[PDB]
Amino acid sequence: QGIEQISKVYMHLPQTDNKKKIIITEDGEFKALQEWILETDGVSLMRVLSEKDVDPVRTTSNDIVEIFTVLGIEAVRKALERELYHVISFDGSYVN
Amino acid sequence: XXXXXXXXXXXXXXXXXXXXXXXXXXXXXXXXXXXXXXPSLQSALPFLDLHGTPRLEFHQSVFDELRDKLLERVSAIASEGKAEERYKKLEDLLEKSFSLVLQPVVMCVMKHLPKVPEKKLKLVMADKELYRACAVEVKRQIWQDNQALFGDEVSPLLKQYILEKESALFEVVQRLTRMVGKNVKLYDMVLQFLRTLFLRTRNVHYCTLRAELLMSLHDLDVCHKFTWCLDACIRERFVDSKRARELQGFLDGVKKGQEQVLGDLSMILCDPFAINTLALSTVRHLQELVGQETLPLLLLLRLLALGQGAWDMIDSQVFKEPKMEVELITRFLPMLMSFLVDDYTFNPESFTKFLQEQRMACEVGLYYVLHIKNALLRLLPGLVETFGDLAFGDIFLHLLTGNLALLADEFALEDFCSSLFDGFFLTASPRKENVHRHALRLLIHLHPRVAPSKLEALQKALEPTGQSGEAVKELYSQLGEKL
Amino acid sequence: KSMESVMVKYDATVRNSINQVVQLRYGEDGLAGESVEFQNLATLKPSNKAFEKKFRFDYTNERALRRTLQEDLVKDVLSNAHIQNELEREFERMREDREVLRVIFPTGDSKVVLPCNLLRMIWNAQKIFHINPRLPSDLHPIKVVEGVKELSKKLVIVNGDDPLSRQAQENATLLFNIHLRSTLCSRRMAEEFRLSGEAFDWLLGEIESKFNQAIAHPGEMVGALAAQSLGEPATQMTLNTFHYAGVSAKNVTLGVPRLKELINISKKPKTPSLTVFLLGQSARDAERA
Amino acid sequence: DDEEETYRLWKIRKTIMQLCHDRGYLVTQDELDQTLEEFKAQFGDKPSEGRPRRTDLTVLVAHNDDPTDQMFVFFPEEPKVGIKTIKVYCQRMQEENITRALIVVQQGMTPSAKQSLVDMAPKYILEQFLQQELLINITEHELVPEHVVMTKEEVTELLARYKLRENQLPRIQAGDPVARYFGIKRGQVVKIIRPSETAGRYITYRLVQ
Amino acid sequence: XXXXXXXXXXXXXXXXXXXXXXXXXXXXXXXXXXXXXXXXXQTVNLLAEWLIQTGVEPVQVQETVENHLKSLLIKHFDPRKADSIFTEEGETPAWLEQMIAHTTWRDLFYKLAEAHPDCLMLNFTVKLISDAGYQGEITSVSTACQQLEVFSRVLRTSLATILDGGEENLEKNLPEFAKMVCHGEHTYLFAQAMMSVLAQEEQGGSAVRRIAQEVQRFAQEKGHDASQITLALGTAASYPRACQALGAMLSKGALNPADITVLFKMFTSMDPPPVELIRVPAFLDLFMQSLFKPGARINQDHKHKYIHILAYAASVVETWKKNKRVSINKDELKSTSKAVETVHNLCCNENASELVAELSTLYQCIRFPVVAMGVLKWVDWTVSEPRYFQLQTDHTPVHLALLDEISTCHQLLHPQVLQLLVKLFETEHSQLDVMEQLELKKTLLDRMVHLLSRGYVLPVVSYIRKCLEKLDTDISLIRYFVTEVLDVIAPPYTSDFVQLFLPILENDSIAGTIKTEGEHDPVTEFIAHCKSNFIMVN
Amino acid sequence: SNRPVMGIVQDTLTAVRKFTKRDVFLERGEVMNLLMFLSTWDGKVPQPAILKPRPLWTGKQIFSLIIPGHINCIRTHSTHPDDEDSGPYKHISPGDTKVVVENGELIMGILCKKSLGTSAGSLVHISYLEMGHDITRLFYSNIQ
């Protein structure tokens, strides 16, 4: 079963709204739907993205070179931005 | 005003309520009634409104003039043009044209009104239609102005052509507004009448805007489609050669065309965009064949197609122009002489003089090779002999193209020779040619040893230039020069 | 040492030592990082009906106009319908800005850094000009609309008139003009702020001044500034300060080594991972998950 | 499996339709997003030696203007494509007058055929794509912003407004998967619209190197 | 002699009086004589229905939209400056005809708008709604109930609605009933007096007493000090000082030990008060608060007095033979006292291995209803502490096994039991593992299945449908609920259970119910029985 | 991080938190001792918050003499109850835990590190932006 280059995958419901699916209701008010997300321990995009019942849009990654093979250079600029803001603002600090 | 069924009764009541007593209760009872609304609200309107206006209910009818009109779209989009709903819409439109002197009937005709047997007759009975002619343009405006209204609207094409002439000396949405109500038969009749009238009167500028209007048929509006599929490569690529070679092969194997090949050659023929495109493609192909060193064969067929294009409008029921396979080498020998002078000067004037005095497509080709210093300075006496040889109209546009190429070059002696060529031919020049000369002289005066003499020559071309536009542009150039 | 030469040139662009453009305007807006504050976009995150209740400036009500405006301005608004058309057009622009913000910010938060603190400037104008907001105000809302439009013309990141420069000026002050429409609209100035005419002229002058002070200075050594701005929190961060999770915890190793793995592009990271979002019903079912 | 194969062929068909539409071609609207069941009806629900086999669904599309050029898309039967397989496609192309084409390889190309694809690049252009590249339209991903190819006139306008050269723009690889998606060649500036949390919108530019 | 009319003939009344006696300068008269500058649009608006006959909808919605626009105009151009004047002037043919025909929402919104003026119009429309057969049904307004003839009849029809409703309608109608009768406290006095006179009868007055108790509970929620009204209605005021003590204590909302010694000196004598003074449920709720909170220690000396007061409240019987008692008994309140004492000791000792140890004695205790209600409140106040679920035995089902015991041995506590379970099920438990949260939800659904087994089924399945449809929980939890319910039930099937259990099963996860059952067939049997019951499924 | 870096260090910060409490009152001599150290004082002793029985100044008045220009900020003290702004007393704080500086004068509230520290939007950051930068140098020196 599954793909290669991957160890045990952990699934969970998120708490912070960065991973919670933020939808816009018909009266225009935002809403945080708490839906199941997976989180692997290896890396292989363009093969997990190919799987059925997987959101091919919001499925990000942790490794940058693998995104640069898959999603290009400007998606790597966005991913490096998000990962760098993550490692900076984990301990509550702020950098502009 | 207008008198409907209830309106005639209203007029009769206004006549019979003018005298004879008839107290207000009986008069108001015999006058009219509102069968929809309740009597309770009509009696509470004095208790609540203090004699208000009920026109907000008519405002709701104006909402019905959209809303049931959308229901008319709900009649139109569900059953795919329902005939019974269309007949009900026609009966309501007849009642609204009889009752209203006609915005709800205007929207009910603009929704969908094809196949109305007394529709065009009912519109011609209300044949003033000044503002209605722009609002009834969904279906009713088609085929009613084909007699004289299309001829009245034709003049704005010439107005936009004059606007483009004045803008080049320094539309898209309107043709779409014409093509909003536009079918195959009306478009064919307008195209045929405008092509006959233009090829009789001028055959100069109307072909370019006709090709631009045919290029504005991209929104799936349905020979002519093959003409659009041909002119897509003319519009898209500016220096298209291999696609142009495929188009020349496609238009060379034509059948016995009953004016369709002549119409295609008319549409290809007179467009400054398309003429410049064909000239640049032919000159790029000539330069590629000079790089191959294999002069005659694909540039010859392109030049022959361009010459057949340029000679279309002189007569009707014609095929093309001759090739002159011996004359082509004599026409392109000065290209080889210019290449030999460039090869000598990067490491003959008499041949170009004799080849420039014996003279259509090859003339414009040699004028479009003028963009690409000893070789040009030697061929320039051949250019003086050419400008003394033919002296045509559009040669000043070729001089403007050479001036754009020289402004890309940035050279002093070439600019002085170009100013000498622009100065020595003020005898039979138009207002546009002198205006372009003054606009190029506004870019003149890089050197201060001849610029005061040209500042005096601006006044020396004011009195001899009896056209007020040329002297007004010279005064404006002097005003812009002092800033 | 990777970025000791990345600076702001005199066309306000960000070029390295060899004149290669890194950014066309500094920080994608042209604003230096000192003169900006955390502000709240009021257009983002109400409902539709709360948005229409709070921003539309309903003109048909008599008594609300009587309470908020002076009677000459009330009959000026109620008489003319051109002014009513312009107020409806600015509410059209605020619905357009709401849709633009909801595309920009899919997460429902609005704490965004922007140069001029507009709510504090409105409150400074109130305290300088001695408003007494119980009384009906005396600024015409068409003066509010036209002053905001002239002000959005005056705030220039990108010079020029050709439409590439027009689009660059539009994009550089997109978010700030959205916030400037949202804070300085007709309804909030009539109802919850109540500035006067001279207070509003002072306000527009102050917004224009404090925006022109926040432009990134040509010559600023942006590269060394950003490298120090990232490396100075590097010493305060710690891999071992965070407690940890006894349950699976996915070895996230945030801190100095993750910053290292981002800084030198490591093809062998210590912990690669994914975040596999499930598509449909499988996102709301533990069994399909 | 056979249902998995018709799902995979339908997703490759969908992604090629979106690729042709984003590249600027004539893609019919129902073809641009058809249902899997519509694909199974039109082609036959058995890729395992049956009716929706390869070479049946070679998609020919023309351009939205200048309708001469076409890139009629190829689907080889074999997993590992080679030169003696692509010369049949070269024969089908030289039978025509059109120079662009896309092949959708299943496994990797033999590298001699990779060199062979470059060995006719001025004559007629061939791009190749693996199956895993075309099971996801990567332009729909949220990390991928809006890439738009710019015309040469807009490039001249860009360089003349900012007074900079093509050497000075920030650049992009030619083997970039979004660049491979749009099929851009070397020296062809790509404007990129992305939302910024500090200005709203930011348009950057990537010349291709 | 004007002859200047387009469609002003409909305004032929006030024109005519301005026509014969015009005089002076009749410029305005002539201008208003031709101020109807449009055509015959009062008839062409009737022709809009004829155009709608060609439209999509030739129905009664067009006249409804016209009447709605007329109502919006009459509310927009409402004559609020001369509202009471126009009310008090004519009122005879206009309001009577309007309340005859268009009494749907017009005068109701008019009395919702201002309601201080137009007393002639308010009185005429109120009397016409009194002339309406079913009631008071138009005047459904929390501030238009300030007229006595209106409010009495509205109270009557709402009581008829609730008393024909039942226990299911007890949750739905009671705020819509209680927002009226707690709006004014004088209306509360009127309503509670009617509750008293109706609950004088033992032939169905218990539901009236129940509705009175929920209205009193809503009055305590919203902010009344309504216990003094409650004691003033009661017979308890016939014995003054006990009722005065209850008045001060229920005005403080807390237990004073000295106050219960004052009560206890009056009880357990040879002259007890009539037992309906102590049966008031807010008083027993304050007993549960002061006695069975996990904190809130009681100082060991008047403790037995507390337990004896609760035992006398929930124990003794009487025989009111013409407003006198002749045979009461006290022979089970010693067992009740022993049970509540053992339970308060088990809630005082706060030692959880001991809670597991004496669980057989605690199962002996919850045979009693007051014990079970008290343990239910204690487990509510224990389990709903945040960060409780950190002792984990089988994801801590011990207190939930006490929920199963309370649900087993009684039936009236089942709404409170379900309320506790759906309060815990909606509560997101932070700092737990997500699988651990999911198994906690599985345990709560096991408890809901146990409530479903003991008869109380329809609110449980109604909540499961409510949380599948509205504001959805995890689908796997509903699948587990369906799996555990269908592993225990068997035909015959009552039609309400089929009607309520069908859409959760057939819509939204058919497939997950059957994986490996085999020996007893899955949902297929319920589908077959559902086809065999109904009339096809419909 | 578009915030100040200076802030108010430890002993000045505890002494200014104890200073700006509600129950701090100052005798006339102690006021005249404190106002001797303001560099930016225009020589006008303010009107006392308590005139009778004894002329008795509140520490927030001296702190309003510190706060320069006319700056306006609303901050929350570190022990502000989160359920205070829900119910009543959201403008009359019973714990004095809602900092309002208004028209350059400290209306109310106790100044913890969330008011004077290096957090963004603090009193010193707004004193930097609204007033000058020499004025903030004076503000730091006067506080210390």
Sign for the CA dihedral angle at B450, B456, B461, B462 comes to positive
Which amino acid, E398? V
The two beta strands, C7-8 and F105-108, are unpaired
Record: contact C107-A80, CB cut-off 8 A: no
> Can you tell me the distance from the alpha carbon of E5 to that of B11, in angstroms, rounded to the nearest whole number?
8
Shortest Cα distance, chain F CAs vs residue A95, angstroms: 5
- F53 inside domain: yes
Q: Does C7 touch chain D (CB under 8 A)?
A: no
Record: contact A71-D177, CB cut-off 8 A: yes
Record: contact B7-E63, CB cut-off 8 A: no
In the structure encoding, which two tokens stand for residue B310, read together? 């340029």
For E39, the closest of B50, B85, B99 (CB atoms) is: B99
- F3 inside domain: no
> Can you tell me the distance from the alpha carbon of D14 to that of D136, in angstroms, rounded to the nearest whole number?
9
Q: Are E311 and E330 in contact (CB under 8 A)?
A: no
- ω before F53 within 30° of 0 (cis)? yes
Q: Are C234 and A91 in contact (CB under 8 A)?
A: no
Fill in the DSSP letter of residue D151. P
In chain B, residues with a C-beta closer than 8 Å to the C-beta of E45 are 34, 36, 54, 57-58, 60-61
- Which chains have at least 3 CB atom pairs separated by less than 8 Å from chain F? A, C
Q: Does A95 touch chain F (CB under 8 A)?
A: yes
Record: contact E509-C281, CB cut-off 8 A: yes
Neighbour tally for B138: CB within 10 Å: 16
Strands in D190-196's sheet, in edge-to-edge order, are D146-149, D190-196, D200-208, D171-172
Residue F140, classed as helix, strand or coil, is helix
Q: What are phi and psi of F26, to 5 degrees?
A: -130, 130
- Which chains have at least 3 CB atom pairs separated by less than 8 Å from chain E? A, B, C
> Can you tell me the distance from the alpha carbon of C251 to that of C270, in angstroms, rounded to the nearest whole number?
9
Q: Which of C29, C41, C52, C185 is nearest to C102 (CA)?
A: C41
For F103, the closest of C34, C36, C127 (CB atoms) is: C127
Residue E29 sits at the vertex; the CA angle it makes with E28 and E32, to the nearest 5 degrees, is: 80
Record: contact E434-A13, CB cut-off 8 A: yes
In chain A, residues with a C-beta closer than 8 Å to the C-beta of E430 are 15
In the structure encoding, which two tokens stand for residue B110, read together? 């603009």
In the structure encoding, which two tokens stand for residue E481, read together? 């609920």
In the structure encoding, which two tokens stand for residue E433, read together? 């593992």
- Which chains have at least 3 CB atom pairs separated by less than 8 Å from chain C? A, D, E, F
- F1 inside domain: no
Q: Which residues pair with F50 in a beta bridge?
A: F56
**Placement of tokens 């291995």 in the chain:** E353
Record: contact C254-A90, CB cut-off 8 A: yes
Q: Are D57 and D75 in contact (CB under 8 A)?
A: yes
Measured in whole angstroms, how far is the alpha carbon of residue B255 from the centre of its chain? 30
Can you state the percent helix, strand and coil of chain C, rounding each to 5? 50, 10, 40
Residue E34 sits at the vertex; the CA angle it makes with E28 and E36, to the nearest 5 degrees, is: 125
> Can you tell me the distance from the alpha carbon of C193 to that of C186, in angstroms, rounded to the nearest whole number?
10
The two beta strands, D200-208 and D171-172, are parallel
Shortest Cα distance, chain B CAs vs residue D26, angstroms: 12
Q: Which residues pair with F58 in a beta bridge?
A: F25
> Can you tell me the distance from the alpha carbon of B244 to that of B298, in angstroms, rounded to the nearest whole number?
10
- F68 inside domain: yes
> Can you tell me the distance from the alpha carbon of E260 to that of E262, in angstroms, rounded to the nearest whole number?
5
Q: Determine the angle formed by the axes of helices B206-214 and B184-201, rounding to 10 degrees.
A: 160
- Resolution (in Å) of the shown entry? 3.2
H-run or E-run covering D16: helix D3-23
Residue B295, classed as helix, strand or coil, is coil
Record: contact A11-E430, CB cut-off 8 A: no
In chain C, residues with a C-beta closer than 8 Å to the C-beta of F1 are 229
Q: What are phi and psi of E227, to 5 degrees?
A: -75, -30
- F5 inside domain: no
**Do D and A touch, counting CB pairs below 8 Å (3 needed)?**
yes
E contact test, residue of B5, B20, B24, B95 with most E CBs within 10 A: B24
Q: Are E133 and E170 in contact (CB under 8 A)?
A: no
In the structure encoding, which two tokens stand for residue C158, read together? 């990108």
Record: contact F2-A96, CB cut-off 8 A: yes
Neighbour tally for C136: CB within 10 Å: 16
What CATH number corresponds to the domain at position F70? 1.10.274.100
> Can you tell me the distance from the alpha carbon of B416 to that of B451, in angstroms, rounded to the nearest whole number?
10
Q: Are B176 and B216 in contact (CB under 8 A)?
A: yes
Residue A56 sits at the vertex; the CA angle it makes with A52 and A59, to the nearest 5 degrees, is: 115
Residue B244 sits at the vertex; the CA angle it makes with B242 and B246, to the nearest 5 degrees, is: 70
Cα–Cα distance list, E158 to E126, E136, E152, E485 (Å): 17, 10, 10, 37
Sign for the CA dihedral angle at C125, C127, C130, C133 comes to positive
Structural domains of chain D in order of their starting residue, each with its CATH number: 1-136 (3.40.1340.10), 137-209 (3.90.940.20)
**Do B and C touch, counting CB pairs below 8 Å (3 needed)?**
no
Record: contact A50-D132, CB cut-off 8 A: yes
- F31 inside domain: yes
Strands in F73-76's sheet, in edge-to-edge order, are F73-76, F98-102, F105-108
Number of residues that make up chain A: 96
Neighbour tally for B93: CB within 10 Å: 25
Q: Are E109 and E71 in contact (CB under 8 A)?
A: yes
> Can you tell me the distance from the alpha carbon of F91 to that of C195, in angstroms, rounded to the nearest whole number?
23
- F2 inside domain: no
| DSSP of D80-109 | S--HHHHHHHHHHHHHTT---EEEEESSPP
In chain D, residues with a C-beta closer than 8 Å to the C-beta of A47 are 132
> Can you tell me the distance from the alpha carbon of C203 to that of C215, in angstroms, rounded to the nearest whole number?
19
Cα–Cα distance list, C187 to C56, C64, C182, E76, E468 (Å): 6, 11, 10, 22, 42
Q: Are B17 and E9 in contact (CB under 8 A)?
A: yes
Domain carrying residue F80: 10-144
Q: Which residues pair with D148 in a beta bridge?
A: D191
Q: What are phi and psi of E242, to 5 degrees?
A: -60, -45
Q: Are B437 and B422 in contact (CB under 8 A)?
A: yes
Record: contact E475-C281, CB cut-off 8 A: yes
Q: Which of E521, E532, E455 is nearest to E492 (CA)?
A: E532
Q: Are C44 and C128 in contact (CB under 8 A)?
A: no
For C267, the closest of A36, A65, A90 (CB atoms) is: A65
The two beta strands, F57-58 and F73-76, are unpaired
Q: By CA distance, what is C36's nearest residue in F?
A: F2
- ω before E492 within 30° of 0 (cis)? yes
Shortest Cα distance, chain E CAs vs residue B138, angstroms: 20
Shortest Cα distance, chain C CAs vs residue A51, angstroms: 10
Residue C51, classed as helix, strand or coil, is helix
At a CB cut-off of 8 Å and minimum separation 6, what does B81 contact?
B112
E contact test, residue of A8, A9, A15 with most E CBs within 10 A: A15
In chain B, residues with a C-beta closer than 8 Å to the C-beta of E74 are 41, 44-45, 48-49
- Residue ranges of chain D whose CB lies within 8 Å of a chain B CB: 65-68, 97
In chain B, residues with a C-beta closer than 8 Å to the C-beta of E40 are 4, 6-7, 9-10, 32
**Do F and C touch, counting CB pairs below 8 Å (3 needed)?**
yes
In chain B, residues with a C-beta closer than 8 Å to the C-beta of E101 are 38-40
At a CB cut-off of 8 Å and minimum separation 6, what does B12 contact?
none
- F144 inside domain: yes
Shortest Cα distance, chain C CAs vs residue D78, angstroms: 32
Count Cα atoms within 13 angstroms, Cβ side, for B309. Answer: 26
Residue B156, classed as helix, strand or coil, is helix
Shortest Cα distance, chain D CAs vs residue B209, angstroms: 18
Can you state the percent helix, strand and coil of chain E, rounding each to 5? 65, 0, 35
Q: By CA distance, what is A83's nearest residue in C?
A: C262
> Can you tell me the distance from the alpha carbon of F99 to that of F105, in angstroms, rounded to the nearest whole number?
11
> Can you tell me the distance from the alpha carbon of C61 to that of B432, in angstroms, rounded to the nearest whole number?
62
Residue F70, classed as helix, strand or coil, is coil
Sign for the CA dihedral angle at C26, C28, C33, C35 comes to positive
**Do C and D touch, counting CB pairs below 8 Å (3 needed)?**
yes
Residue A32, classed as helix, strand or coil, is strand
The radius of gyration of chain A's CA atoms, rounded to the nearest angstrom, is: 15
Q: Which residues pair with B473 in a beta bridge?
A: none
The full 3-state SS of C137-172, as one line of letters, equals ECCCHHHHHHHHHHHHHHCCCCCCCCHHHHHHHHHH
In chain E, residues with a C-beta closer than 8 Å to the C-beta of A12 are 434
Q: What are phi and psi of B123, to 5 degrees?
A: -75, -35
Considering its fold, how many domains does chain F have in total?
1
The radius of gyration of chain B's CA atoms, rounded to the nearest angstrom, is: 34
> Can you tell me the distance from the alpha carbon of D108 to that of D80, in angstroms, rounded to the nearest whole number?
6
> Can you tell me the distance from the alpha carbon of B373 to that of B341, in angstroms, rounded to the nearest whole number?
10
In the structure encoding, which two tokens stand for residue C237, read together? 């961060």
- Residue ranges of chain A whose CB lies within 8 Å of a chain E CB: 11-13, 15
Record: contact E430-A15, CB cut-off 8 A: yes
Shortest Cα distance, chain C CAs vs residue E77, angstroms: 12
The method of structure determination was cryo-EM
Could you give the residue ranges of the DSSP H alpha helices within B346-450? 349-356, 361-368, 374-387, 395-409, 412-423, 431-442
The radius of gyration of chain E's CA atoms, rounded to the nearest angstrom, is: 33
Task: Count contacts between C and F (CB, < 8 Å).
Answer: 28
Record: contact D68-B236, CB cut-off 8 A: no
Residue E8 sits at the vertex; the CA angle it makes with B3 and B98, to the nearest 5 degrees, is: 15
Q: Are C185 and C144 in contact (CB under 8 A)?
A: yes
- For residue E44, count CB atoms less than 10 angstroms from its CB and return exposed for 0-12, middle for 13-18, buried for 19 or more: buried
At a CB cut-off of 8 Å and minimum separation 6, what does E89 contact?
none
Neighbour tally for E127: CB within 10 Å: 16
The radius of gyration of chain D's CA atoms, rounded to the nearest angstrom, is: 19
Q: What are phi and psi of D51, to 5 degrees?
A: -75, -40
Q: Which of C34, C31, C36 is nearest to C229 (CA)?
A: C34
Q: Does F5 touch chain A (CB under 8 A)?
A: no
B contact test, residue of E6, E9, E30 with most B CBs within 10 A: E9
Measured in whole angstroms, how far is the alpha carbon of residue E49 from the centre of its chain? 44
At a CB cut-off of 8 Å and minimum separation 6, what does E481 contact?
E445, E448, E449, E464
> Can you tell me the distance from the alpha carbon of E227 to that of E248, in angstroms, rounded to the nearest whole number?
9
Q: Does E102 touch chain B (CB under 8 A)?
A: yes
In chain B, residues with a C-beta closer than 8 Å to the C-beta of D68 are 232-233, 243, 246
